[PDB]
Amino acid sequence: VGLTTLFWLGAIGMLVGTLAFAWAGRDAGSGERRYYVTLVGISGIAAVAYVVMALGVGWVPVAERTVFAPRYIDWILTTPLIVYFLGLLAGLDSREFGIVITLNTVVMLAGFAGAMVPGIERYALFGMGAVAFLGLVYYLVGPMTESASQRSSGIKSLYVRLRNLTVILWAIYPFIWLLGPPGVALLTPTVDVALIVYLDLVTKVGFGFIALDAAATL
Ligand SMILES: *C\C=C(C)/C=C/C=C(C)/C=C/C1=C(C)CCCC1(C)C
Numbered sequence: 001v002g003l004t005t006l007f008w009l010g011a012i013g014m015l016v017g018t019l020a021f022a023w024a025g026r027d028a029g030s031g032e033r034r035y036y037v038t039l040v041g042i043s044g045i046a047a048v049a050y051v052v053m054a055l056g057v058g059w060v061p062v063a064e065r066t067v068f069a070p071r072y073i074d075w076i077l078t079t080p081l082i083v084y085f086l087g088l089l090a091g092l093d094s095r096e097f098g099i100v101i102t103l104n105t106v107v108m109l110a111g112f113a114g115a116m117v118p119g120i121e122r123y124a125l126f127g128m129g130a131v132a133f134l135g136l137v138y139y140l141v142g143p144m145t146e147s148a149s150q151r152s153s154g155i156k157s158l159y160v161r162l163r164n165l166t167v168i169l170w171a172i173y174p175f176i177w178l179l180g181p182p183g184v185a186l187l188t189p190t191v192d193v194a195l196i197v198y199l200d201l202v203t204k205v206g207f208g209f210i211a212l213d214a215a216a217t218l
Pocket residue numbers: 046075078079107108110111112126127129130133170171173174177199200203204
């Protein structure tokens with residue numbers, strides 16, 4: 001198994017998700033459509049990013065390592081969509097959406113910049129993102145959860161189900177970044193990539209399938 005192969009698997013998984021979310025969003029009421037559209041964009045962007053990486057593009061040499069730029073472009077665009085999805089589910093008002101979306105962006109921009117910096121100062125960027133991520137988790141389990149408590153029993157359950165999925169799995173990315181090439185480079189690129197592809201598919205497509213499951217029921 002090689003990087004190219006892992007990237008293709010990522011692209012295929014994202015493509016299957018995209019097609020299923022677009023298809024499932026065939027009917028979609030005049031207000032429940034925004035959810036499906038977010039799911040299609042999320043997995044859609046990731047698919048492209050992966051095909052691009054698969055086609056060997058965006059492999060940027062930094063110091064003595066490689067940085068998959070497409071991966072970060074993907075995250076910078078898709079993570080805010082996920083937050084937006086949870087915000088819609090939790091029923092947030094513009095103000096709260098703003099705070100969570102900016103914290104998210106700080107996390108992603110910081111991780112991207114840190115990866116691109118060859119020197120040791122890069123850990124200072126990683127720290128920024130990590131700190132911003134804590135604030136994000138705070139809003140997900142506190143203020144956003146409280147807000148979701150105002151929605152019906154089932155919507156509240158879906159929100160909690162997706163919230164846990166997101167919080168637990170997102171908390172793992174930083175550890176892989178730190179042990180992978182960007183950090184101490186303990187884990188090899190292939191191992192780093194294999195792990196991240198699994199994580200990307202679950203936090204994106206699995207996340208979408210759990211949502212579809214809930215929708216069907218209700
Ligand atoms: C494609 C889907 C997802 C959910 C991608 C998520 C990426 C992260 C949660 C990345 C997080 C980072 C953190 C929390 C700390 C600083 C360094 C990272 C950018 C790797």
